[PDB]
Amino acid sequence: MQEHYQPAAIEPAAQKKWDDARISNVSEDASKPKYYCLSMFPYPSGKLHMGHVRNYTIGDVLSRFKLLNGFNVMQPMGWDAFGMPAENAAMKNNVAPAAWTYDNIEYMKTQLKSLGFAVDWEREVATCKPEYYRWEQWLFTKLFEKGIVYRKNGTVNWDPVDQTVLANGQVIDGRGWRSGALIEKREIPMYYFKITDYAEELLNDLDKLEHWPEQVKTMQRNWIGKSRGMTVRFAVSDDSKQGLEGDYAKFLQVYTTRPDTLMGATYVAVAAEHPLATAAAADKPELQAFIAECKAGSVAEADMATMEKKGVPTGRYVVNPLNGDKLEVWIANYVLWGYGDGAVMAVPAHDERDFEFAAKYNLPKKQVIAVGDNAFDANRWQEWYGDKENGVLVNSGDLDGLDFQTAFDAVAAKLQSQGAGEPKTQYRLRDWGISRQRYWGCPIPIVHCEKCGNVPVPADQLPVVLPENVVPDGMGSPLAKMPEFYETSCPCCGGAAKRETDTMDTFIESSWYFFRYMSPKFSDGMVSAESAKYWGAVDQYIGGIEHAILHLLYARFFTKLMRDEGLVNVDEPFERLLTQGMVVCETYYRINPADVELPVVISGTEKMSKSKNNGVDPQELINAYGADTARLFMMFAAPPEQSLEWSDSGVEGAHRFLRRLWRTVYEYLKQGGAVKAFAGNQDGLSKELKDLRHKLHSTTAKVSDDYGRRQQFNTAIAAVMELLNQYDKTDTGSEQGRAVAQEVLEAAVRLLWPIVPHICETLWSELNGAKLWEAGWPTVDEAALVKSEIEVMVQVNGKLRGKITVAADASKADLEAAALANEGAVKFMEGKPAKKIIVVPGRLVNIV
Numbered sequence: 001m002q003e004h005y006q007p008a009a010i011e012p013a014a015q016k017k018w019d020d021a022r023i024s025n026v027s028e029d030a031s032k033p034k035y036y037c038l039s040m041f042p043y044p045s046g047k048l049h050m051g052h053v054r055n056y057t058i059g060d061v062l063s064r065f066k067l068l069n070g071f072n073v074m075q076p077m078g079w080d081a082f083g084m085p086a087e088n089a090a091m092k093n094n095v096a097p098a099a100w101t102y103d104n105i106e107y108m109k110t111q112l113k114s115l116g117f118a119v120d121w122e123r124e125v126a127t128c129k130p131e132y133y134r135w136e137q138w139l140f141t142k143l144f145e146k147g148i149v150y151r152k153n154g155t156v157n158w159d160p161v162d163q164t165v166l167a168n169g170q171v172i173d174g175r176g177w178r179s180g181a182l183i184e185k186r187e188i189p190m191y192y193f194k195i196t197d198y199a200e201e202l203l204n205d206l207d208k209l210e211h212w213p214e215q216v217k218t219m220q221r222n223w224i225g226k227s228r229g230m231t232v233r234f235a236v237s238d239d240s241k242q243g244l245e246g247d248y249a250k251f252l253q254v255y256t257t258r259p260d261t262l263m264g265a266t267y268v269a270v271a272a273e274h275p276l277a278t279a280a281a282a283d284k285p286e287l288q289a290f291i292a293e294c295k296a297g298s299v300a301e302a303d304m305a306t307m308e309k310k311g312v313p314t315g316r317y318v319v320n321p322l323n324g325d326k327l328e329v330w331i332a333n334y335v336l337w338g339y340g341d342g343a344v345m346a347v348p349a350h351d352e353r354d355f356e357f358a359a360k361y362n363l364p365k366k367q368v369i370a371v372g373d374n375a376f377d378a379n380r381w382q383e384w385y386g387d388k389e390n391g392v393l394v395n396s397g398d399l400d401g402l403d404f405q406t407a408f409d410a411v412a413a414k415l416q417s418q419g420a421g422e423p424k425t426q427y428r429l430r431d432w433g434i435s436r437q438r439y440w441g442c443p444i445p446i447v448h449c450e451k452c453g454n455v456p457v458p459a460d461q462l463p464v465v466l467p468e469n470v471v472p473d474g475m476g477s478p479l480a481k482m483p484e485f486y487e488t489s490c491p492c493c494g495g496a497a498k499r500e501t502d503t504m505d506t507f508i509e510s511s512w513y514f515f516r517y518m519s520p521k522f523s524d525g526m527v528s529a530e531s532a533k534y535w536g537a538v539d540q541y542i543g544g545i546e547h548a549i550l551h552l553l554y555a556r557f558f559t560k561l562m563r564d565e566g567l568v569n570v571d572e573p574f575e576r577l578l579t580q581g582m583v584v585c586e587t588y589y590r591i592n593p594a595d596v597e598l599p600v601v602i603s604g605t606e607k608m609s610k611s612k613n614n615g616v617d618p619q620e621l622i623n624a625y626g627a628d629t630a631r632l633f634m635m636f637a638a639p640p641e642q643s644l645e646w647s648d649s650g651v652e653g654a655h656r657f658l659r660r661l662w663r664t665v666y667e668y669l670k671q672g673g674a675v676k677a678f679a680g681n682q683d684g685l686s687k688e689l690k691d692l693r694h695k696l697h698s699t700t701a702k703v704s705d706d707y708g709r710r711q712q713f714n715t716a717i718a719a720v721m722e723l724l725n726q727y728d729k730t731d732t733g734s735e736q737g738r739a740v741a742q743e744v745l746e747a748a749v750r751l752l753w754p755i756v757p758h759i760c761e762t763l764w765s766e767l768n769g770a771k772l773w774e775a776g777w778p779t780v781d782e783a784a785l786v787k788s789e790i791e792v793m794v795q796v797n798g799k800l801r802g803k804i805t806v807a808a809d810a811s812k813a814d815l816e817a818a819a820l821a822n823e824g825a826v827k828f829m830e831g832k833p834a835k836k837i838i839v840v841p842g843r844l845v846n847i848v
């Protein structure tokens with residue numbers, strides 16, 4: 001064995017050993033328990049950074065742990081390759097997005113290999129390849145004919161100067177980011193997934209996820225935004241029907257989640273596009289201007305929560321169906337047309353938005369809810385005003401005294417009796433628009449025939465192959481300018497027709513890739529039945545909380561869709577979820593910290609990202625210190641959920657520990673060579689060696705619990721460090737001493753193998769001749785945890801009367817019980833009770 005730690009030499013050697021043994025190339029092995037550990041696959045932007053290293057090292061720690069415990073572990077890697085970063089680099093370097101993508105994959109795959117993750121590279125997928133995306137095209141056509149996917153007009157942001165559709169993130173103050181031109185709102189046909197049809201399933205199945213973080217489930221529930229409310233119709237007053245037709249002439253319909261406060265409604269509000277708004281503004285210019293200012297804005301909830309709530313009265317009136325009050329209709333900029341009925345009632349006394357609105361315009365505020373003896377003040381808002389749990393109704397006639405649900409059900413029956421309303425469940429969830437007017441993306445498998453309409457491409461003709469010899473300019477999708485792509489024949493009638501030129505939302509690729517990994521070479525479906533039956537669901541998922549809403553929702557949606565098609569038989573894709581904390585680093589601009597000395601503007605610390613160029617290139621870290629030093633630093637610096645600060649100090653400390661680990665095994669082997677590890681009964685071992693074995697097996701239990709249950713890797717390393725500390729303070733030079741040292745070192749290297757497998761694989765082979773993965777995860781020797789028993793003297797009134805042998809973990813009650821049961825004590829007690837039993841643990845028990 002070489003004396004000094006040489007990561008640059010041993011890490012490639014260890015990787016070749018693992019590759020030649022095919023330890024990570026797994027099949028559907030019914031002879032082993034499966035374990036599917038998945039890390040969120042990355043965008044091939046060019047090169048990874050320490051954040052990506054942290055993510056994938058975490059996934060590899062869990063994978064290797066389960067591997068050592070005999071699981072058949074699948075840990076697949078792949079590339080989320082479609083998207084805008086390629087197009088922007090395409091128009092910047094004048095290269096095809098595909099070519100820029102595949103070269104990025106090349107460099108990043110070698111970066112990944114050099115870190116030594118235990119990854120089945122035979123299951124690698126790249127989502128921009130037709131062999132992958134043909135199956136989401138397949139699923140699209142299947143759902144399209146069932147109407148789960150449908151086509152309808154929707155609104156987009158059109159830039160008249162760049163001639164491109166832009167997202168809400170590229171429009172700033174109503175203008176394009178790279179043009180500064182006023183953005184038009186165009187209605188264009190687009191394709192949607194009817195995810196609202198699955199809202200109840202998507203919400204309720206969250207309760208199955210007993211091993212998900214509660215905040216992630218909470219975020220899913222709020223995004224879906226289910227409410228149980230009341231449709232309530234207000235009959236239009238006789239003097240306010242001018243210009244209204246249809247149902248709008250006879251009633252105004254609203255949705256509310258607080259029908260228990262319908263008796264406290266003081267005004268009503270409609271959206272600017274509401275027919276009441278249009279009819280009342282036909283002769284009032286001020287209302288036209290307010291309607292125009294309303295449509296001149298985005299319905300973005302981000303902009304609306306800070307938006308100044310404004311409104312104008314209309315002079316029209318409707319009638320509350322419960323108490324007969326005539327209520328004035330207002331046009332309000334907070335009422336959104338297309339959500340519910342486009343109209344709402346207002347109860348300022350119990351809704352904070354309605355309170356501030358009615359405070360600005362001095363509208364009535366009528367209390368209908370009381371929470372105990374709390375005083376109601378119509379000129380201040382308290383939190384208990386909107387209390388839905390501890391309130392009872394007042395000023396409500398029949399309904400006085402009821403709680404929320406009792407008044408709800410009571411109002412429900414009354415409205416249905418008068419035909420003036422009924423209960424209704426609504427959801428904030430909108431359908432999933434998947435059309436993108438971009439080139440680098442999955443083509444939508446639709447053909448437009450002037451006779452047949454929107455026709456899906458037959459399965460035999462899939463994939464619709466995206467042409468890769470394209471260099472986008474940015475003035476519109478190149479597909480719409482390539483007749484050799486869009487000109488085709490109609491698959492229904494054979495006539496001249498045009499392919500759809502929009503491509504799919506790139507979230508679609510990441511909504512099912514975890515299944516494609518189960519059989520990534522299957523050419524008869526999305527995923528083979530046999531492989532789906534074997535791998536079931538993802539056992540462990542690891543990725544940042546930035547993707548905890550849409551991605552997860554979409555992946556869960558697709559899972560149910562694929563299940564309903566008979567492709568899989570699980571309800572939920574991911575059983576456990578781990579959200580790693582972000583890695584941060586001090587920033588510099590005028591720039592990478594490696595191209596900087598310790599002039600440019602030195603600033604503070606923030607997340608590692610290509611935006612500020614604050615990302616430490618791991619390849620420079622590996623060339624400098626080694627893969628194991630990189631992995632150890634990440635796992636040791638902080639709990640995986642906590643944020644991780646880059647530190648040259650932390651890198652050096654980790655490297656010194658690997659040198660210490662190497663030196664420890666080398667100095668042990670040079671003093672006598674390898675021996676059989678201690679095993680069996682430890683009676684006869686010295687106190688110091690019994691204590692070391694206690695430290696050893698206590699450490700094994702602690703690291704096993706930290707990997708498997710708590711998923712805290714920094715404390716697991718600290719526990720092995722303490723074991724080594726006690727090892728260093730123990731005389732292990734005797735025959736029994738060497739045997740225990742062998743046992744300690746054989747366990748330490750296996751306990752650390754998931755975190756630093758290169759050095760541990762090498763050290764193990766110097767200690768033991770068996771395959772490390774065959775030797776398995778270290779077992780706990782429970783006998784090594786039992787400490788010796790103590791002899792306690794029993795005294796009756798201070799006189800020595802007997803002796804008891806107690807455990808080293810006996811309580812004060814066990815010492816009292818054993819002392820009262822001793823024969824010498826029971827004889828000197830003369831049947832008389834004890835006023836006190838003074839107990840000195842380990843010394844004496846005095847019975848008085």
Ligand SMILES: Nc1ncnc2c1ncn2[C@@H]1O[C@H](COP(=O)(O)OP(=O)(O)OP(=O)(O)O)[C@@H](O)[C@H]1O
Nearest residue numbers: 227255256257258334335336339340342343344345
């Ligand atoms: N289209 C709409 N635009 C704006 N506000 C609306 C609209 N429809 C209903 N509202 C108002 O929003 C209230 C609550 O609806 P929301 O979707 O916010 O449910 P919620 O947050 O679960 O309810 P709660 O605030 O009672 O807990 C309704 O009582 C009504 O006053």
Ligand SMILES: Nc1ncnc2c1ncn2[C@@H]1O[C@H](COP(=O)(O)OP(=O)(O)OP(=O)(O)O)[C@@H](O)[C@H]1O
Nearest residue numbers: 040042043051052055543544581582583607608609
């Ligand atoms: N600084 C970081 N620290 C920790 N994990 C990170 C960091 N940056 C990315 N990751 C994680 O690595 C995986 C891939 O990240 P990727 O950079 O591809 O996407 P992203 O987070 O959307 O990008 P961006 O950093 O530009 O916001 C995800 O699980 C993500 O949470």
Ligand SMILES: CC(C)C[C@H](N)CO
Nearest residue numbers: 040041042043080510
């Ligand atoms: C699961 C996916 C949404 C993850 C992206 N490819 C990278 O952040």
Ligand SMILES: [Mg+2]
Nearest residue numbers: 207208209210
């Ligand atoms: Mg269960």
Ligand SMILES: [Zn+2]
Nearest residue numbers: 449452490493
């Ligand atoms: Zn046709």
